[PDB]
Each structure stands twice: as C-alpha cells, then as structure tokens.
Amino acid sequence: IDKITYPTRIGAVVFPHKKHQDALGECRGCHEKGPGRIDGFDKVMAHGKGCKGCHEEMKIGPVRCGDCHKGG
Numbered sequence: 001i002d003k004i005t006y007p008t009r010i011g012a013v014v015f016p017h018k019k020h021q022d023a024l025g026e027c028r029g030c031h032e033k034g035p036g037r038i039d040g041f042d043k044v045m046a047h048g049k050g051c052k053g054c055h056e057e058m059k060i061g062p063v064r065c066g067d068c069h070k071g072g
C-alpha cells in the first residue's frame, strides 16, 4: 500500500504515502504514537499539522484547496 485515498464531498484527496516516507526518511514525525492509524485524523487535522500545515512550513507540497482536492 503506497497511496491512501480520502473520499470527500469537495473532491477526493490522494495521499502518496510511500513518497512521503521516502522524502522524510522517518516515521515518528507523522506517527507520534508509533506507526499505524493516527487517532483523531479528520478535516481539521489534515488542514493543520496532519497535512497542509507541513506543506506550508516546508514550502513544498499542495497548499491550495484544488491541489489536494480533485474530482469534483
């Protein structure tokens, strides 16, 4: 499993998981409580430190709505 798709009303988001693990070369950063499900992962988390927040800080990755949400 390399890609994780999040089906959302506003347009589905595809998370290229392997790309991220290869790019960051670490697990604990995103998986604070050890690799596995991330408890409480939702819209607010994704728009925050869960997804968009990192892209803004690292200045790489999608930060604009449509660069994540695609498919109508």
Ligand code: HEM
Residues within 6 Å of the ligand: 004, 017, 020, 021, 024, 025, 026, 027, 028, 029, 030, 031, 035, 036, 037, 038, 039, 041
């Ligand atoms: C080799 C290091 C990594 C390991 C072993 C790992 C492992 C996993 C596993 C086992 C899953 C599936 C969990 C499930 O089905 O509930 C997953 C999901 C996920 N991983 Fe990783 N991961 C790694 C690195 C990363 C990195 C670097 C990020 C952050 C850029 C990340 C973010 C996520 C997210 C957001 C999910 C979905 C969580 C959820 O749906 O609750 N992972 N990862």
Ligand code: HEM
Residues within 6 Å of the ligand: 006, 007, 008, 009, 010, 011, 013, 041, 042, 043, 046, 047, 051, 052, 055, 062, 063, 064, 065, 066, 067, 068, 069
């Ligand atoms: C201000 C611009 C954005 C808007 C207006 C927006 C809007 C939304 C909305 C309304 C939801 C809730 C689900 C739905 O109603 O369909 C959502 C979920 C989510 N958004 Fe965004 N989003 C934006 C930017 C982003 C960006 C840039 C990313 C990717 C880095 C992203 C990733 C996600 C993810 C992964 C979820 C699903 C979380 C879950 O499955 O619980 N969004 N977004």
Ligand code: HEM
Residues within 6 Å of the ligand: 013, 014, 015, 016, 019, 020, 023, 024, 029, 030, 046, 049, 050, 051, 052, 054, 055, 058, 060, 061, 062, 068
């Ligand atoms: C589930 C939440 C996240 C979503 C939906 C997401 C989505 C994406 C997508 C679609 C790309 C662009 C891939 C491409 O170049 O085609 C990307 C790239 C990237 N993201 Fe995320 N991301 C998430 C979380 C994170 C987190 C938490 C970090 C930092 C702690 C991060 C760091 C990066 C970096 C470094 C890249 C460049 C990877 C590359 O192009 O090789 N992302 N992200």
